[PDB]
Ligand binder design. Structure first.
Ligand SMILES: COc1cc2cc(c1Cl)NC(=O)C[C@H](O)/C(C)=C/[C@H](C)[C@@H](O)CC(=O)[C@H](OC)/C=C/C=C(\C)C2
Ligand SMILES: COc1cc2cc(c1Cl)NC(=O)C[C@H](O)/C(C)=C/[C@H](C)[C@@H](O)CC(=O)[C@H](OC)/C=C/C=C(\C)C2
Ligand SMILES: NC(=O)OP(=O)(O)OC[C@H]1O[C@@H](n2cnc3c(N)ncnc32)[C@H](O)[C@@H]1O
Ligand SMILES: NC(=O)OP(=O)(O)OC[C@H]1O[C@@H](n2cnc3c(N)ncnc32)[C@H](O)[C@@H]1O
Ligand SMILES: [Fe+3]
Ligand SMILES: [Fe+3]
Lengths: 679, 675
């Protein structure tokens, strides 16, 4: 029983189903493979096409999943899609009314076309199963919990008909107890509010990071006009006929004006974030109080995108409403894609479930066999120096104890947004200045936001207040208080209100990462590291060896540890050996606008990425000429000869484009097919 | 007492308030000027910036209105804006949350900035009056009716709070009787359905033109699921939570697929149009049946964008519900801008109203005086031959009787969408083949589209069934039946269902055009002409003399009659003497995407117009290089030297860009300030 789970939209690599398809139209595309009821592989398409939360069809994700399973496409018994067919097709139909030149291709025909063209797979119609959206969520959240029954709450922006759903789960049976309609969306409320902070889709976590800096009392009575808690776990959100945003009209009427790009957060902005976070907490605890009492259940699984609000999750943990709480590492739509595979297996009879509670999110493609890794790092030699220590973990622990910030890349990439010891950046958690330091190091701007700690299972209760319910901490799903007498010791990872989003690593959840944190604890007396994701501000979490080396060379980390190899950048890295390649969305443009007296105006050159929200950058006439000659095989240095050679100015210009990922820059060739490592 | 009426958004000529600001965000920007209660000038900005139904701030329209009134900015006593301040600002604020780089400039600051930078006019806060949207519509529609009491119905997509409002009007006082909420919008319903036919905003009257070719039975029971008529003049529209379109989910579930652009209109599409039109007719007549008997009014004024549904209007006319019906030539938001002037005047003193019923929409800028027109036509000499007949109307009537298709441009341009004898294309109304060809060859549009007739007031009842209420036909507001015994005679202007959107012209509504139609009737026996708007498919109604001549030369017209000059295109016209100029929205781009094996793709070159819904076109590398040198003063022939001379291929390529209006091509200089 080999079942593929699919979520996302249907766009090709280089174009979208309609031009500039909005970033929220079926996002976080991913592919998941289950076999005999176990999740054998899962990866988000964003890791492979390098577009954060991409909506594009997850063709590469499917290819990677089939290879991790040793399967041909034709081996797949069924395909589950995370929305009902009529809903996705009606939304596509609406996009087609807005773009009358777009050919009428609905979801079943598009899925069949992408798989046939992209993999030579003729998918028979009877193998494609469409699934109710919150049902897919609930299966993913509950089947990995290891509980034999639970109350299951799903909250997100919306499924086909609901913004929230409540189930009772028993064995492999879901029974729906309640639902909440689309206009009551809490994910909708949170995203509406996020826009008022100069932020957008995918920035909700930054708003949650900002909330503890604010006073929730300032706007408490304003938000109280936008919701009413009601009897029997009900609630209302009070809409308006002015604009498609629940929040902006009332706040505008009271003089609140939205933050502009590059403007610093005012006290009003911090307070707004606080009252927003308090509002959603109050509503969800209202829901859960009613359904805990009504169902009588002591266990909760919480899924949907709203369940990535780890602040909310820590409040649920401390509420005493439940004895146990489980949250999946991918509770957003990538996890609904996984859940859609289980629902498809159930639809076709044979629903087999995982034998254990999920402990490791390490489920994507690996970096490769060590012989092809060694070989590929040699291709990077003009830019890096490599050491091959005898005990890389031991060396890494000492470097960390000496105060260096490390890139840490091992094995299979994490499913879901948190890095957990496979595509991570780690450093000493004690020094508070590591916050400003490592933020500048990776060109990010979340200094207001602390980093997440990782602690050994053994030491976990020596530093963190896990009490209340028994929650799962292998994925940083919960904010917990830092013990008051350890707060000053844990300066980099403790928030302004004394809390932290802790990963508890165990020998079972991640053996190598556990050994690393334990070893550092032996060396310093503090078995706590900070653990942030391995990516700069212009990319999702790095996936391949080439991605890892690129991100290392374009950030200011001290050392990279990748599959026992110690990597450092040469004193003068030779960019000229790198072969530039366009990404499928790269566009290179010379533009003339209108000028004064109706002349042809200013003539500028730019590079940009052709997707909704994609970045763009000005380029010099010289680099424009160089990049226009990119052929995918000639090196940057050889291409630069046509404009006089790779000057220091050009190399610096190229490097800044590299940092923003406008195009691929890597040595010639590639690492080759990922090795069958026998696991 | 001089009052400016304003409507539209606040964008500059070359950018929008946010990038790619949607075409429906405060559209049909216009300016109107009233003086002592009379409308002295009105023009839509689309005529001046050449962007159909533009949302850009109507800066040119204000300047032109002041010139027509002989006024300086400082003479203006007040400025009315056609929406309440809190509503437009809340929408602006929403756009600013989606575009965090946009500075927080709201409507009051934006209006004052545009008038200061654009006209040197410092507008005091106390002179800017914001007006409820349907109130503005109602003043415009009622005060021009010549009625001293009436029921006034406003139906559009939405105002600030309502999709529909019903007023009692008596003297100069409006009293609200009823309103209908935003989700009951009939304008929204019609636009939602328009999108299923491969059309967009602005195409509603094409759907209306399609409907008589369909059978409303096919989809009658489908549309019946989308609305319910209720007691005492009420109704409901039944929404959905799947997509922001009332119509498309149900019709998708029943197997109806949206038409693609550039594909035929099938019988299912025609049937869909017919059932939509019947649906809106049923709802509006339900509303009006109730409010006619309840309010006790024998006379109706109907405004809002829905009142440009001339089929609906003709049914209202035949319903027997009213004795008289009036519809303003600009019943869409440009007319709400005019109404906002009357409201602003009412808020700062007693309201002065027009003395008489409006008979003429000839209210925009004229073409110029005789001397400057003749001199400017001399600038076009390398492209045109010009004759100066003793009696140009006599001559034009003869050319029409001989089968010629004429451009006709005289005096001040029409306010509102219909051409009425000031910026018109006219032809013999008798041969059905004229409809076939003027659709296919001249306007280049769909073969199903009707053509509208103009008839003399003296002969109107010889050809059209005007029975029922007394409606005003000076602006083609009403579809009426063509008398059965005249349908064969009027082959080009009788629609498939035997009706026509008639203009009745009189010596009082348009003396010159009436003389033309009457003389044609004396020559042929038939005092009826085909009258379509003077524009190709890439442009709004032509405004200036250069606009008129450019449009004549790029559409297949036989002859142009412009202010008594007979213009024909030269045998071999010299495009090399035209001076290319960029429009403020013209853009030129050389572009590479990705190519095979992650290479840079092959370069392509394009010209496009930078606004939401703007066209684009590929251009040769040679023309790309030529257009990059455009300076606004050098001729096309001189510019082409740098690419080795204006070859035949380059002239042909340039001509096709000119026809789509990607750039301005006109002789050196301009006509000067209009005399
Ligand atoms: C212009 O056309 C629209 C616009 C909206 C709605 C719909 C349509 Cl057709 N109609 C739907 O049905 C939405 C659909 O199901 C969908 C994209 C679901 C994904 C998988 C959710 O994850 C997204 C969200 O929840 C999102 O916030 C992040 C809310 C977006 C609402 C909107 C973007 C408003
Ligand atoms: C994404 O942001 C939106 C979107 C919508 C609505 C609003 C907002 Cl903020 N909220 C409004 O209030 C609209 C406002 O009042 C307005 C533009 C009024 C003009 C003058 C009307 O003429 C337009 C129409 O009637 C139009 O179809 C032609 C309907 C468009 C509705 C929409 C395109 C849906
Ligand atoms: N079908 C569907 O809706 O997709 P989905 O399961 O992937 O959840 C996305 C939603 O979770 C919301 N969301 C994401 N992070 C959030 C956070 N930290 N707090 C609140 N809401 C959040 C986000 O704003 C968005 O509304
Ligand atoms: N504030 C506001 O809404 O502006 P507005 O007065 O300018 O009218 C626009 C509305 O008239 C509708 N509309 C335009 N032509 C129409 C037609 N022939 N039939 C029905 N609706 C029409 C159009 O679809 C749109 O919904
Ligand atoms: Fe979801
Ligand atoms: Fe209106």
């Amino acid at each position: 029983m080999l079942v593929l789970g699919l979520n996302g939209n249907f766009s090709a690599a280089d174009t979208d189903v309609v031009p500039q398809l909005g970033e929220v139209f079926f996002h976080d595309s991913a592919a998941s493979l289950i076999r005999d009821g176990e999740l054998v592989a899962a990866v988000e398409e964003e890791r492979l096409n390098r577009i954060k939360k991409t909506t594009k069809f997850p063709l590469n994700a499917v290819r990677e999943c089939l290879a991790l399973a040793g399967a041909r496409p034709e081996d797949v018994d069924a395909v589950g899609y995370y929305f009902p067919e009529n809903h996705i097709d009606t939304v596509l139909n609406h996009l087609y009314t807005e773009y009358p030149r777009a050919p009428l291709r609905y979801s079943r025909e598009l899925i069949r076309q992408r798989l046939k063209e992209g993999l030579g797979w003729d998918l028979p119609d009877e193998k494609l199963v469409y699934v109710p959206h919150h049902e897919a969520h609930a299966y993913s959240s509950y089947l990995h919990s290891g509980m034999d029954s639970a109350l299951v709450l799903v909250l997100d922006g919306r499924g086909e008909l609901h913004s929230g759903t409540v189930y009772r789960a028993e064995g492999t049976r879901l029974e729906k107890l309640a639902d909440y309609p689309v206009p009551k969306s809490l994910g909708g409320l949170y995203l509406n509010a996020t826009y008022l902070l100069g932020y957008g889709f995918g920035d909700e976590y930054k708003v949650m990071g900002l909330a503890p800096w604010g006073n929730p009392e300032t706007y408490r009575d304003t938000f109280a006009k936008l919701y009413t808690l009601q009897d029997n776990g009900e609630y209302e959100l009070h809409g308006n006929i002015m604009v498609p945003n629940l929040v902006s009209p009332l706040f505008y009427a009271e003089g609140f004006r939205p933050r502009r790009k590059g403007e610093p957060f005012t006290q009003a902005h911090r307070d707004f974030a606080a009252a927003l976070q308090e509002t959603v907490e109050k509503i969800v605890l209202h829901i859960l109080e009613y359904w805990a009492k009504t169902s009588g259940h002591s266990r909760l699984c919480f899924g949907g995108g709203v369940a990535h609000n780890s602040s909310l999750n820590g409040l649920i943990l401390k509420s005493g409403l439940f004895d146990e709480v489980f949250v999946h590492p991918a509770s957003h739509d990538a996890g609904a894609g996984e859940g859609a595979a289980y629902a498809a297996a159930a639809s076709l009879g044979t629903l087999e479930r995982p034998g254990k509670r999920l402990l490791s999110a390490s489920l994507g493609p690996a970096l490769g066999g060590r012989e092809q890794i060694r070989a590929r790092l040699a291709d990077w030699a003009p830019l890096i120096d490599v050491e091959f220590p005898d005990d890389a973990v031991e060396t890494a622990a000492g470097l960390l104890a000496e105060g260096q910030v490390l890139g840490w890349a091992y094995g299979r990439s994490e499913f879901g947004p948190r890095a957990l010891g496979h595509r991570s950046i780690v450093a000493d958690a004690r020094p508070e200045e590591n916050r400003t330091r490592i933020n500048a190091m990776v060109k990010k701007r979340e200094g207001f936001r602390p980093f997440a700690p990782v602690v050994t299972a053994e030491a976990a209760r020596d530093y963190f207040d896990l009490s209340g319910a028994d929650g799962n901490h292998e994925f940083m799903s919960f904010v917990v208080p830092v013990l008051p007498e350890r707060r000053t010791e844990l300066g980099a990872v403790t928030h302004v209100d004394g809390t932290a989003r802790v990963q508890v690593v165990s020998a079972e959840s991640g053996e190598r990462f556990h050994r690393l944190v334990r070893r550092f604890g032996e060396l310093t007396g503090t078995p706590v590291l900070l653990n942030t994701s391995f990516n700069n501000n212009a990319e999702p979490i790095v996936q391949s060896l080439d991605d890892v080396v690129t991100s290392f060379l374009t950030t200011d980390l001290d050392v990279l540890v990748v599959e026992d190899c110690l990597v450092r950048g040469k004193a003068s890295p030779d960019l000229g050996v790198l072969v530039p390649r366009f990404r499928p969305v790269t566009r290179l443009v010379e533009r003339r606008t209108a000028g004064p007296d109706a002349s042809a105006g200013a003539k500028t050159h730019e590079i940009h990425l052709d997707y909704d929200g994609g970045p763009s950058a000005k380029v010099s006439p010289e680099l424009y000429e160089l990049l226009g000659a990119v052929d995918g095989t000639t090196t940057l240095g050889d291409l630069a000869k046509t404009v006089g050679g790779l000057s220091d100015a050009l190399a610096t210009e190229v490097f800044a484009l590299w940092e923003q990922r406008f195009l691929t820059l890597a040595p010639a060739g590639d690492i080759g097919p990922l090795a069958d490592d026998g696991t």
